Amino acid sequence: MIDYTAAGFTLLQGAHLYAPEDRGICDVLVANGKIIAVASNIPSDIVPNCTVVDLSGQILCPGFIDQHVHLIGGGGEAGPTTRTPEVALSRLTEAGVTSVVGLLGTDSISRHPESLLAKTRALNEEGISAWMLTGAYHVPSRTITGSVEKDVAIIDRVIGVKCAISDHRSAAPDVYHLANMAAESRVGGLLGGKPGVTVFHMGDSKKALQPIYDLLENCDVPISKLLPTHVNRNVPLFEQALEFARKGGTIDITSSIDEPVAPAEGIARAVQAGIPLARVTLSSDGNGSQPFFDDEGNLTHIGVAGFETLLETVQVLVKDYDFSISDALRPLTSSVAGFLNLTGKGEILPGNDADLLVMTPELRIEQVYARGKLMVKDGKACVKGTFET
Amino acid sequence: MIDYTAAGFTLLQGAHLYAPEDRGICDVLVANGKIIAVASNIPSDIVPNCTVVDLSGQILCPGFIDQHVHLIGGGGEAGPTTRTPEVALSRLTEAGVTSVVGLLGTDSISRHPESLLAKTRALNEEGISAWMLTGAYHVPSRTITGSVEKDVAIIDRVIGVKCAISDHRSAAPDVYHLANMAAESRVGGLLGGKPGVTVFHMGDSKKALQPIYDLLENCDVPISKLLPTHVNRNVPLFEQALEFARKGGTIDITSSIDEPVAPAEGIARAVQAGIPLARVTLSSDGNGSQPFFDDEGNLTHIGVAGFETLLETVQVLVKDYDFSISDALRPLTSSVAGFLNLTGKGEILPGNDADLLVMTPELRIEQVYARGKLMVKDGKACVKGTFET
Amino acid sequence: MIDYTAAGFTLLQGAHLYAPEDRGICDVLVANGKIIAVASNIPSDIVPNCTVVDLSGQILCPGFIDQHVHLIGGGGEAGPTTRTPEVALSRLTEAGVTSVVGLLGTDSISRHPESLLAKTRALNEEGISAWMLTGAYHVPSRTITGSVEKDVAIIDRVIGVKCAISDHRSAAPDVYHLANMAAESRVGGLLGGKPGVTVFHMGDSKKALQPIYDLLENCDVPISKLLPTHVNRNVPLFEQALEFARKGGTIDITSSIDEPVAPAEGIARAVQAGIPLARVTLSSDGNGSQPFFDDEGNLTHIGVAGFETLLETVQVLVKDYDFSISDALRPLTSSVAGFLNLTGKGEILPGNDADLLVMTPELRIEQVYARGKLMVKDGKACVKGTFET
Amino acid sequence: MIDYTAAGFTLLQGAHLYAPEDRGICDVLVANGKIIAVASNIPSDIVPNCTVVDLSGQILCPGFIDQHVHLIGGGGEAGPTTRTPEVALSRLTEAGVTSVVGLLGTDSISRHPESLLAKTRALNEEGISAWMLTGAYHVPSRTITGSVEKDVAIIDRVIGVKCAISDHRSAAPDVYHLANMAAESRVGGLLGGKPGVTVFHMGDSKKALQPIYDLLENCDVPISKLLPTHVNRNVPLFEQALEFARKGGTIDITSSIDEPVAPAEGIARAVQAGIPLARVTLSSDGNGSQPFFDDEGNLTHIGVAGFETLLETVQVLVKDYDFSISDALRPLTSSVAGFLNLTGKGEILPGNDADLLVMTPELRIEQVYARGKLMVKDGKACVKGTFET
Numbered sequence A, B, C, D: 001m002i003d004y005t006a007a008g009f010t011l012l013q014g015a016h017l018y019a020p021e022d023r024g025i026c027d028v029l030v031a032n033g034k035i036i037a038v039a040s041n042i043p044s045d046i047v048p049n050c051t052v053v054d055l056s057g058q059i060l061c062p063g064f065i066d067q068h069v070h071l072i073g074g075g076g077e078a079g080p081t082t083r084t085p086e087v088a089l090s091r092l093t094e095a096g097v098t099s100v101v102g103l104l105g106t107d108s109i110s111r112h113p114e115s116l117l118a119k120t121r122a123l124n125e126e127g128i129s130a131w132m133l134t135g136a137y138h139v140p141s142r143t144i145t146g147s148v149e150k151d152v153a154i155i156d157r158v159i160g161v162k163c164a165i166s167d168h169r170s171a172a173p174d175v176y177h178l179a180n181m182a183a184e185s186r187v188g189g190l191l192g193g194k195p196g197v198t199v200f201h202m203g204d205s206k207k208a209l210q211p212i213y214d215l216l217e218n219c220d221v222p223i224s225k226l227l228p229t230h231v232n233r234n235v236p237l238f239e240q241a242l243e244f245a246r247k248g249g250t251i252d253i254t255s256s257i258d259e260p261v262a263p264a265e266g267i268a269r270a271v272q273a274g275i276p277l278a279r280v281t282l283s284s285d286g287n288g289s290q291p292f293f294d295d296e297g298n299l300t301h302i303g304v305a306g307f308e309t310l311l312e313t314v315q316v317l318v319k320d321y322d323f324s325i326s327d328a329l330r331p332l333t334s335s336v337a338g339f340l341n342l343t344g345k346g347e348i349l350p351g352n353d354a355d356l357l358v359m360t361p362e363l364r365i366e367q368v369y370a371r372g373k374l375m376v377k378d379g380k381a382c383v384k385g386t387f388e389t
């Protein structure tokens, strides 16, 4: 016998594949964590030491990419006890997440980019794929190297910058500050080969997207680099978002937000609005707090987001909204990889990474592969974080 | 015998001299790298140990001054592989260039002024004349001493500052920032005895020269110190440039730009426009990248500029545009030396530096003298950079 | 027809394999840039779309790891005209180099770690494997993030720090300074998963290795993290190096140094002195200058190192010294990978990266694979750096 | 009539020339500020538009290099009223000084290197040759760019660094501090093409040269880069200076110090001690104060140094000591140019700069040429600084 085990040959057989594109019943061959073949009827013997998997009667689709996650924990709006814990690997995989983008939020005093960066690396080490955004709510941005432009250019895992606008928790940034920060991210991205995006956490202020427009008049950053998130938090806001996307911008809907615009609802409206799913993304905001402010900007209620709403959103869309499974997945798969330029992610194509989900026809997660590795079986993590308990 | 070789007496005989002014058939005597005499019929014996050169049937003219060169290399817009290599001496001389001004571009993270400065000095050491601009696209400027005003005042080779406006790769500078930076360069120039110019890399933004005008309203810097470059990159832009020059400004046309306004074309239009050649300069942008952005600010194509377009431009002008050789040379000779106040350069006058070109009547380079030294013979570098291979 | 091309299946058939360990005539199967199987007689049909290569008659071995190259150039010891040029991809590959460690030297004023960092990524992007050392001759170290520890911990390509001792070009560091730096490097390595080494450039001072010894008594940094290079520069130095390795240290021999101790000669004595090859490495110092200094510390002669000395050394060892091919390889392969912990490098094993050299039985390089990609064919690069001409 | 005036042809006829080497009665031909020929009997008609000068009866020699002047003023040791005034051009020239090295002293609070730097350029601009030393008594050094190494490497006029030891006015530097600084200077010189020296101001402390020796053992800086000045300030000091030169060091004698060892007397003993004149220099310390301190370190008397002591010393040497004129000159010429590597200075050779002194046979200065320009006529300056009155 000759040993060919180093290749990790895996053949996933008989599933109804959504690439996301519906490819009907198709096969997928994997080696060294990469998809090396996609076709109907692949020879179970085509390669030595192959692990064959019968997925007949099952759905096969790309892993989710969650671009809004408080990896190291977040919160703190109601003081120190409200600091949320760090994210555990198993909570992501089990939710279908195989690629994630970490960021900071309100607190950047007890929360640091260097911490966020080490955690990002831990996750890659443990099997999934992770990147981060530098900055936080605070503007100017608190960086690792002292320059937003520098952080994006030279820190491998940094792909852009985060900020807070139209929020009672913002730093009251002016347009110069915003423009310069976005322009730096843009430039850093070209030098480092990163998307160089600027993510705007939106609050409830009446000004809504104004600041974005102003920015656009005060710089030459492409609209394709600006990403407003939580767009469903309020009506008027959601509405402007739709125009923004119509003008070519992309928009990020938060699945952990149920009122006033539900996630599935929002997506559907965007389409009806004539916006292409490619310019619509869905993110969780997992591990952040769900702070609720009153009339006088006083906190009242505070909770913590999880990742289940992701799948739930997809299910809904299909179930109650006439969406095709294909269509329903885009906002968590190719639209994201497409916006962030995540090479090798969000699509099942030869040459892409083996980040795959195995589900039941009714859309329930059964298996999860990360870079070709089995992470979840029977809806249960079989691979956990070094200290997961 | 007495040895008078230290003087390096050279007598260039019988050429049709363009000073650039047409001086018909005239002689040029050189000593210690300086032009010591210009007259018809100089006695081949007037001085001991004289090297006599018969240039009969040939054209003699001043060396080009290229004020836009990425000496240390540039690029990087499409990531690290796109970083261009440093400039080799021979590539300049062979192209007729004897004086050059180095600068930085988009990247000032992997690119540094101290590097640019050491390279500048190397070139002077090897025989040609070189200066640099401090700063880069980024505003505020990244300097050597920490102050634009300081760099221009105290670093001998620095003659001004560079910046990027109306470009999707700019740093989103505001007017205060621009004004202050130009005002600093202005002041530093008076203290250090430098032109103290401010060079503006122009992009494709609709705002075009606006920022310049605004600046002008927000400071008392003389229009003669502001230099917009790449003016031929787009029509509307080119058009505003013409008014700008009409208002007394000088403009820099980029020879490496063929569309939408060709170099020769631009020059011709400026004249027809009633602008004096003295306020029109031509620069190469050699060794920089030729990045091409799409609709959404996405790169598509990327190349690297060389120096041949310089001469080619001159040839064209004469050839296809009814320009006099004299006139055709100005934009690469006296207009430049005149704008930057390069003393001893751009004109063949007693007391000036022996920076001369020998060409065929059809305008082809045969010989090149830098500070009286033979650098190119028969269109071939006979003097190369320390590591040129 | 099913496409399986994504896999990059390549089978290297019937060469005499030195892993470096002599494996006699053995086959090598590659996929995705990985070595997936090594064994005698592999079925050319074992995998689809395979590219079969007949190496019968030839030698196959691991690609070289050169841990001492001035990637972006060096020199400057005699003025700006002496700054050497960056390294070209093809230069490396053609010399059998598939893995490299970039560093800085004397000049850390016109040279910057950020530049080095970028160049290193470009090389990875182009096809080979590259890392770097932070710091330079100067002590205290000039870093990217402002701290040696921080640089080693957080910048992905940084594996340790560089410095100079016992040289008329040193910073006159004291012991505290040395110790701290190495400590920092040590610790950053733990945090970042890097070797955390400290490389000492050795000069021609009489104090020789003292500083390393003192250091040892002034800190708890393992002797296994300390690397003295250019050991062959002088006799008395060479000799202490020997004892140093004897104490468990590892020494680095410079192949570009002929006198007094030539490379092959240095390795022979190591062995004679009873030193295990594992503790002996060979590196080029390619692209650095060859500055020769007088009695009064005055430069005289200055040259520029290449990579041919590496293969040359191997040849000589085998040819004039009676070293086994296997043993001759070690210092450029397993030994290096061994010291730097370059996982997946230095040996031909399943799971390892497909960095392979194909040579004639007379030790001539014919082909070169970097991460399984054909880089050199018939002793010539079919893969060039973006700007090679 | 052809104009050849640009050349500045001047022929110095029939003087007894000391290059300093006795060349007997020899002619000197100048052009462009350069010495183009030296020989007996040069044809007054050898070159056009020549200015012929009859030096028959006179002595011609090289202009003095004073490497120790407080160009911008000094003093301050007894309050602000004691700050001396800047140096006036004419003051220098009249004293035979054509080349100068400016520096700072005790006070580095009201005095700045930037000021010094500017003053140095003004002098070059006005007609002579000037350089400076960075630092001052204070250690660590107060620099322009923030680093000694950086200043020596990148500021064109900076040739090294200054400091003070064994003085009640010192900064109490320790050895590390000293060593580092000199190292820095050393290295910056290599990079910038400068001598890279370190000049030690000697005080009247009993420790005398110790610090220099310690230093020597704590670094690899060549003894040839270290200059102790004011050696004649005290006996015991003088005496170690002697051995110091004996070891290969070069010592600097202050002409403005009469007791205990007078200048001429210091030079005589050097020679007596068998020291080669090449290792002995003379400098004025012009414009510095003459602060006399008590027993309790209290100031008593305070005065201001001039430049007449230089010529005076020469005179005395010849006149009361039996030194050859030739030998008497050395310490102010070839020796200095020699130590500082002032190319084109200190000797009368073709190719050298035309910095010449014309004296009476009794050693009286009549004329002075700086870079071939007549600066002094009939012992008086016909060329004055911009603000002299």
Ligand SMILES: N[C@@H](CC(=O)O)C(=O)O
Pocket (backbone or CB within 6 Å): A070, A073, A074, A075, A076, A104, A105, A106, A107, A201, A285, A287, A288, A289, A290, A291
């Ligand atoms: N509340 C979140 C911030 C956000 O969700 O925008 C946090 O943890 O900082």
Ligand SMILES: N[C@@H](CC(=O)O)C(=O)O
Pocket (backbone or CB within 6 Å): B070, B073, B074, B075, B076, B104, B105, B106, B107, B201, B285, B287, B288, B289, B290, B291
């Ligand atoms: N693309 C150029 C910048 C410019 O040409 O404006 C560079 O090399 O940075």
Ligand SMILES: N[C@@H](CC(=O)O)C(=O)O
Pocket (backbone or CB within 6 Å): C070, C073, C074, C075, C076, C104, C105, C106, C107, C201, C285, C287, C288, C289, C290, C291
């Ligand atoms: N001469 C080399 C230094 C060395 O080999 O460390 C350089 O480029 O700096």
Ligand SMILES: N[C@@H](CC(=O)O)C(=O)O
Pocket (backbone or CB within 6 Å): D070, D073, D074, D075, D076, D104, D105, D106, D107, D201, D285, D287, D288, D289, D290, D291
């Ligand atoms: N007294 C002088 C100092 C010295 O001579 O070094 C001064 O002006 O500071």
Ligand SMILES: [Zn+2]
Pocket (backbone or CB within 6 Å): A105, A201, A202, A230
């Ligand atoms: Zn938010």
Ligand SMILES: [Zn+2]
Pocket (backbone or CB within 6 Å): A068, A070, A104, A105, A285, A288
């Ligand atoms: Zn959030």
Ligand SMILES: [Zn+2]
Pocket (backbone or CB within 6 Å): B105, B201, B202, B230
């Ligand atoms: Zn530009």
Ligand SMILES: [Zn+2]
Pocket (backbone or CB within 6 Å): B068, B070, B104, B105, B285, B288
């Ligand atoms: Zn440019």
Ligand SMILES: [Zn+2]
Pocket (backbone or CB within 6 Å): C105, C201, C202, C230
């Ligand atoms: Zn070295």
Ligand SMILES: [Zn+2]
Pocket (backbone or CB within 6 Å): C068, C070, C104, C105, C285, C288
């Ligand atoms: Zn080296």
Ligand SMILES: [Zn+2]
Pocket (backbone or CB within 6 Å): D105, D201, D202, D230
């Ligand atoms: Zn002193």
Ligand SMILES: [Zn+2]
Pocket (backbone or CB within 6 Å): D068, D070, D104, D105, D285, D288
């Ligand atoms: Zn003094």
